[PDB]
């Protein structure tokens, strides 16, 4: 009977929700996240098979609002809707409150949708891992991950996809050694972490690296300029 | 605030330099804000404790008593509890003690903590024992245990027990020290293993 | 074998990851070393996906 | 979906549920003669985890607490819920919810959406506490949609223990700061490795009306008794 | 005591962590910390290869997932 | 109905007339016509007594349902977009002219709000029928960035002014002064209008009108 | 109310009063008139004080939904499309006004009119407002193509004053809001700047 | 089990959706290559039965006077998902008063796409299609939509059973610096070659276009300009042969 949506096991169990975590595990990349002190920093695998694609047009980083950034990890369908979702969630929040939805909040709201999906069995968990990035008034570098089972939680660092626990580790690891950093040392270990969980050097191109400062209140994707600066720098 | 940090500071240094002159700069603190009070006086009871002027540990506890915990945190439990644990840590057991557990007990009636009730009465007999008194340490020991009987296990239970069988090795005859020794043993079979407890069971 | 063998701790146990991250060009090279192509040796297409 | 009543007069999915809940993150709560104090396990899975951000203890009025063991969505929507409907009882009586008619109405809301067909029950038992009046009030929230009034009591993984050692501990003659002792104490029993002061979470209820213990003050009791 | 530690050994610690771990798995700790310790040419173990050899030998459960509980 | 508020320094002071009038009568003397719509934000009403109090709680009922859900103090401007929203959803039945006030992480704010919904952030706004005298007495005497004492003098002024040139407005004066930490509300801060202290007594003898029919009853305890 | 919108080369400049009456009780002296929508369209309200807030503000998350979408910066003429629709269905709810104007790529410097009623027009410059009677004659006669940044700013400040001073409903500040690569540069005539014809 | 979109695989993986593209892969063929200038289009449209007719059932279509799609797989879901295209170009042009971006359409489809395989009392769409469209604002723009509902922008590609011959060939060009007008022809180069004609036995090559060259408009090859590409594709094919 677990086959529905939501149907608790002999002792709960909740075996389609599960099976939204291995889908989220198999969306077929990575992505890790990090905050600094004042500044914060996502990193994420991006392949261009059969050389065609390319260009903005392929890519897993999206700016939910001018001042949040998000990242996904999951069936790409699934993962663009929750992204639009989350868009008219913001779009809405700031219609009715009339300022820019906090990342905890547009968090929280996904986070309950998912939740209803596993809740009533008629909508599917739909199997991806949302990440925001944001700043607040007086939080500065949030970020947030949250997951289709409802989970809404905020990491100071954070990883998605199929080598989350490895980077964890290593994040772990880290930021246990004087967790304050600047700007440089904060992309610095997000691109170093990605690199070492994945053991490949990286180009420009195959990655897509946003940023959101305090003095910056914008969600920016660096370009391959700024990308491939920072690689060869470090 | 910033100023108490600041005599904090000179108080850390001067402890460096010369004790005798952070020890007065931290009396003339706790003399003299509720993080500044408190603070100073966990800073003062350290330097005592560390110069071995724990003569004036008495008169700090009875005058403090009457605002411990009216200046705030009545949770001051805190401070309770580390300077008695610091008093009974100085093993050079000389003089005071005299009507200081006493009025202790007394406390106004003000924290009513079962828990450290039982733990202060534990260590006033404990005390007992060390100053060669043991039959009052017998009377009250048992009436700690026949009232807090219902768990305690582990730990303060066994300190009790521990406290008993030393009393009547002392003067009950060897006997009863086995009977308490083995009930002590066995409800102590299932300790979290404090090295303390453990080496003074065995 | 795979994970499930009843109880067989201590030792040394080592993952084998099914994918490769650049090794799998050199795995494509050392299988290309059969008779050069008679031109361009470069394995890049294959590289690249 | 849930109507399937086994051949024996019992609802299966609930004693899933009920297991489920079970394995659930250890809470406890003690009602003391001027307040109750509720504690749970908040142990985060590393120190990665922002503990600051998913809260576990939650004030749902003024002088209203309630805390879960189990599923941290469901937990999610029922205080959403719990809010909701104390705040339009507010609206309509101009004066907050009691203790009483909240944990009905929550534990009717956990009846109706047990009552469908497309629906699964939650997976969380809940502790409200209340001081409404000059009395202060302790409810666990089953899953069934029953709500059974307490003198102190713990859920989650090892709550028979936890309730034996309660039964054992309390005495009517008990000031919070006792309770509170209590609380960290059974926690501790139920906790495995150290009690660092953030990865537990507490909130207390007293005439001061329900508050959650800052890190500070969760730090100073665990130092304190540990 | 057999093995060559070093006075950064700081085991009075490493028991003290909690965890599930059996006699296998100390022996199996001192061997792969002597490992490393080889690997890397020490000369006595380390604290760092005790730690690296917790990890590779303890450990590794997960799926436990927040949501799961 | 006289409503006031304006915005010192740092923070805001709100001053109400103390009446409601259901109809042409002084329904009451001590009108609650100044409403805590969350912490740090109260607002002042007037128009119908009843559409000013019912729009007032239910505003503050989700301000705070907002707020708890944050563990952060809501905002001015989420307190006014509500408003406006509402009183335009509702063209124009409602009766309650509302004077919006708070004060939060990003300074105060102080906002009108017409019954259509209008809205006009202004650093001090009066409205109800005193309205009038009142924003001559903030015209004639208001400079930017006031400070307290004076500031709750003249919102006094003005409200007295409306008081002395406006029928159907109150006796007494309510004040409430919001900052980043203080909530003051003086309840009524002034009593222009005391009572016309009731000369010798008037009363009637004992035993003035036999009953027809008595239904004493002891209710048991 | 009275307000003016006039385009020029690379961008276009805006002017409103800053008055909102009701008959009387001139109420928000300061009106902010011209408005904002996403990034660099402005609008200019005239009529019910009330239905242009909320037209405006529904608009303007309507658009900055839709830009959000497209990753692409607005487009003036999807603003103008968006409140023509809007008031073209709720004509008779509505008794408002507007003027659109603003910079995007494709076609930068753009100034649209829907007034009362919801029609559409491209147009060099707008006039809208009670004052608009007054002025629509003296800009239709002054006007002259190629005006450049300040050109159009003078233009404006002497057509919106003149429209102040020759009706009541009008009355306070002239604000003025500059559109184009630099951004939006708000500046406001207070009781000098403001031109003085007799 | 894999029998309804709630049912995840235990692996995570939902099976309908993987039908989807099963049944996808029955279609001959459908190719198209984003010329620098446009956006060009082509398909194996397999004549099943002699006594159709041309002019007939086609598997590309418009939308709007400036967006084109070619289709491959169920030719009923192929007919529906180019109608509701249709009329989410209509509706934003009633909205915004211009012709809609080719990359919010396909986002919209692809979403539609999405609720269809999401919903239980639903099965998702039997068929995937490829977007063409151009603007000088824009430049020419192509994207590829599936069951499961990804929208890519490719400046090639394909979809159907030759999908993969069609991707080789697609990457043996010069994509980014050629004109339609040759583009058409190695499309049809493309269809012909990719053709099995030991199996097909009939066939019909169907092109069609939309660039600058048409002021961004979609429409079938002319008459002329599609017999000479076949001709010249006949002739790829007899210089391959030999």
């Known amino acids: 009977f677990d086959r529905h949506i939501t149907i608790f096991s002999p002792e709960g169990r909740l075996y389609q929700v599960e099976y939204a975590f291995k889908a989220i595990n198999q969306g077929g990349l990575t992505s890790v996240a990090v905050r600094g002190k004042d500044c914060a920093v996502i990193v994420t695998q991006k392949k261009v098979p059969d050389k065609l694609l390319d260009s903005s047009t392929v890519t897993h980083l999206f700016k939910i609002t001018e001042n949040i950034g998000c990242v996904m990890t999951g069936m790409t369908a699934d993962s663009r809707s929750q992204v639009q979702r989350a868009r008219y969630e913001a779009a809405n929040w700031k219609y009715k409150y009339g300022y820019e939805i906090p990342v905890d909040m547009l968090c929280k709201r996904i986070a309950d949708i998912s939740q209803v999906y596993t809740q009533n069995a008629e909508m599917r968990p739909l199997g991806c891992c949302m990440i925001l990035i944001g700043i607040d008034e007086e939080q500065g570098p949030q970020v947030y991950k949250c997951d289709p089972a409802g989970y809404y939680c905020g990491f100071k660092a954070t990883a998605a996809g199929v080598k989350q626990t490895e980077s964890t580790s290593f994040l772990e690891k880290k930021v246990k050694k004087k967790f304050d950093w600047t700007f440089e040392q904060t992309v610095e270990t997000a691109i170093t972490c990605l690199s070492t969980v994945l053991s490949i050097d990286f180009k420009p191109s195959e990655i897509e690296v946003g940023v959101v400062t305090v003095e910056n209140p914008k969600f920016r994707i660096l370009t391959e300029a700024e990308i491939d600066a920072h690689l060869v720098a470090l | 605030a910033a100023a108490a940090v600041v005599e904090f500071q000179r108080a850390q240094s001067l402890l460096s330099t010369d004790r005798e002159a952070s020890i007065d700069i931290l009396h003339s603190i706790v003399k003299r804000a509720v993080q500044v009070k408190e603070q100073s006086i966990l800073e003062l009871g350290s330097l005592l404790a560390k110069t071995g002027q724990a003569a004036e540990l008495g008169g700090l506890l009875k005058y403090v008593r009457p605002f411990l915990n009216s200046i705030s945190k009545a949770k001051a439990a805190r401070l309770v509890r580390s300077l008695l644990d610091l008093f009974l840590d100085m093993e050079a057991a000389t003089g005071q003690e005299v009507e200081l557990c006493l009025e202790c007990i007394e406390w106004a009636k003000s924290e009513k903590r079962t828990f450290l009730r039982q733990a202060l009465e534990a260590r006033l007999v404990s005390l007992y024992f060390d100053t060669k008194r043991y039959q009052e340490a017998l009377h009250l020991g048992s009436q700690l245990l026949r009232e807090l009987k219902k768990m305690d296990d582990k730990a303060l239970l066994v300190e009790v027990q521990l406290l008993e069988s030393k009393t009547y090795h002392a003067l009950s005859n060897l006997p009863k020290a086995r009977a308490a020794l083995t009930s002590a043993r066995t409800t102590a079979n299932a300790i979290y293993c404090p090295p303390k407890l453990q080496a003074t069971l065995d | 074998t795979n994970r499930p063998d009843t109880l067989d701790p201590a030792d040394r146990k080592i993952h084998i990851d099914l994918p490769n991250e650049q090794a799998r060009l050199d795995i494509l090279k050392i299988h290309a070393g059969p008779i050069t192509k008679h031109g361009e040796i470069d394995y890049e297409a294959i590289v690249k996906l | 979906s849930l109507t399937t009543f086994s051949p024996s007069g019992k609802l299966v999915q609930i004693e899933y549920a009920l297991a489920a809940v079970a394995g659930g993150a250890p809470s406890v709560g003690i009602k003391a003669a001027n307040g109750v104090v509720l504690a749970t396990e908040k142990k985060q899975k590393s120190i990665l985890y922002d503990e600051r951000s998913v809260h576990k203890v939650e004030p749902i009025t003024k002088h209203i607490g309630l805390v879960y063991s189990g599923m941290g969505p469901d937990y999610r929507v029922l205080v959403h819920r719990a809010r909701k409907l104390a705040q339009q009882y507010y609206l309509v009586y101009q004066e907050p919810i009691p203790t009483a008619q909240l944990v009905q109405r929550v534990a009717s809301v956990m009846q109706e959406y047990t009552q469908s067909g497309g629906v699964r029950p939650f997976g969380v038992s809940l502790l409200i506490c209340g001081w409404n009046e000059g009395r202060p009030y302790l409810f666990q929230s089953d899953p069934s949609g029953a709500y059974f009034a307490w003198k102190a009591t713990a859920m989650g993984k090892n709550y028979v223990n936890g309730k034996t050692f309660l039964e054992k501990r309390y005495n009517e003659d008990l000031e919070l700061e006792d309770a509170i002792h209590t609380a960290i104490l059974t926690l501790k029993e139920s906790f495995e490795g150290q009690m660092t002061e953030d990865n537990i979470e507490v909130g207390i209820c007293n005439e001061a009306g329900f508050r959650r213990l800052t890190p500070t003050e969760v730090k100073d009791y665990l130092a304190a008794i540990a | 005591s057999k093995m060559n530690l070093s006075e950064e050994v700081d085991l009075e610690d490493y028991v003290a962590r909690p965890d599930k771990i059996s006699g296998a798995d100390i022996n199996s700790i001192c061997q792969e910390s002597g490992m490393l310790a080889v690997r890397e040419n020490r000369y006595i173990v380390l604290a760092k290869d005790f730690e690296k050899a917790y990890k590779t030998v303890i450990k590794k459960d997960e799926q436990e997932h927040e949501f799961y509980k | ?221 | 109310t009275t307000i003016m919108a006039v385009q020029f080369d690379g961008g276009v400049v805006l002017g409103a009063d800053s008055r909102t009456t009701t008959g009387s009780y001139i109420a928000n002296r300061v009106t902010d008139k011209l408005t904002p929508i996403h990034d660099r369209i402005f609008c200019c309200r005239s009529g019910s004080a009330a239905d242009t807030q909320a037209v405006a503000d529904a608009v303007t998350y309507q658009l900055g939904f839709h830009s959000i979408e497209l990753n692409e910066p607005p487009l003036v003429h999807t603003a103008a499309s968006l409140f023509k629709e809007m008031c073209y269905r709720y004509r008779e709810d509505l008794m408002a006004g507007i003027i659109i104007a603003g910079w995007d790529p494709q076609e930068g410097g753009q100034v649209y009119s829907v007034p009362m009623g919801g029609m559409m027009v491209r147009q060099s410059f707008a006039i809208g407002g009670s004052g608009s009677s007054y002025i629509y004659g003296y800009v239709d006669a002054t006007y002259r193509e190629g005006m450049t940044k300040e050109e159009c700013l003078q233009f404006t400040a002497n057509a919106l004053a003149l429209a102040m001073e020759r009706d009541g409903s009008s009355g306070g500040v002239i604000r003025l809001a500059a559109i184009a690569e630099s951004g939006v540069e708000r500046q406001v005539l207070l009781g000098d700047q403001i031109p003085k014809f007799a | 089990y894999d029998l309804s979109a709630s049912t995840f695989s235990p692996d995570g993986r939902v099976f309908q959706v993987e039908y989807a593209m099963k049944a996808v892969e029955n279609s001959s063929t459908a190719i198209g290559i984003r010329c620098k200038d446009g956006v060009v289009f082509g398909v194996e449209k397999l004549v099943l039965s002699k006594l159709y007719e041309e002019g007939s059932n086609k598997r590309l279509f418009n939308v709007d006077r400036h967006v084109g799609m070619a289709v491959a797989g169920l030719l009923a879901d192929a007919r529906s998902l180019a109608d509701i295209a249709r009329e989410e170009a209509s509706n934003f042009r009633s909205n915004f008063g211009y012709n809609i971006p080719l990359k919010h359409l396909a986002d919209r489809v692809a979403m539609y796409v999405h609720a269809y395989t999401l919903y239980s009392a639903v099965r998702p769409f039997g068929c995937s299609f490829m977007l063409g469209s151009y603007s000088v604002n824009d430049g020419a723009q192509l994207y590829m939509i599936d069951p499961s509902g990804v929208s890519y922008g490719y400046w090639g590609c394909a979809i159907g059973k030759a999908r993969q011959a069609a991707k080789t060939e697609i990457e043996k060009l010069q994509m980014k610096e050629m004109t339609c007008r040759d583009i058409v022809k190695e499309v049809a180069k493309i269809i012909y070659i990719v053709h099995d004609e030991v199996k097909d036995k009939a066939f019909e090559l169907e092109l069609s276009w939309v660039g600058e060259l048409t002021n961004g408009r979609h429409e079938i090859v002319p008459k002329d300009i599609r017999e000479e590409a076949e001709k010249y594709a006949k002739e790829s094919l007899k210089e391959e042969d030999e």
């Not at chain 6, 006094?156 to 919001?178: K, M, Q, Y």
């Open chain 6, 1 to 221: 109905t006289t409503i006031a508020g304006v915005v010192y320094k740092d923070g805001i002071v709100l001053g109400a007339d103390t009446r409601a009038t259901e109809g042409m009568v002084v329904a009451d003397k001590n009108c609650s016509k100044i409403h805590f719509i969350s912490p740090n934000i109260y607002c002042c009403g007037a128009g119908t007594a009843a559409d000013t109090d019912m729009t007032t709680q239910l505003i503050s009922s989700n301000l705070e349902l907002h707020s708890l859900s944050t563990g952060r103090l809501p905002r001015v401007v989420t307190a006014n977009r509500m408003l406006k929203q509402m009183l335009f959803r509702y063209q124009g039945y409602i009766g309650a002219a509302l004077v919006l006030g708070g004060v939060d992480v990003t300074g105060p704010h102080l906002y009108s709000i017409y019954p259509h919904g209008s809205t006009d952030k202004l650093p001090y706004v009066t409205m109800g029928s005193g309205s009038l005298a009142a924003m001559a007495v903030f015209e004639d005497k208001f400079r930017p960035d006031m400070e307290e004492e004076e500031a709750k003098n003249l919102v006094s002024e003005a409200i007295a002014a409306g008081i002395f040139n406006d029928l159907g407005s109150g006796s007494n004066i309510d004040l409430c002064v919001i900052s980043k930490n203080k909530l003051d509300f003086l309840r009524p801060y002034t009593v222009p209008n005391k009572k016309g202290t009731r000369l010798g007594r008037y009363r009637c003898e004992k035993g003035t009108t036999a009953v027809l029919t008595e239904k004493i009853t002891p209710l048991e305890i």
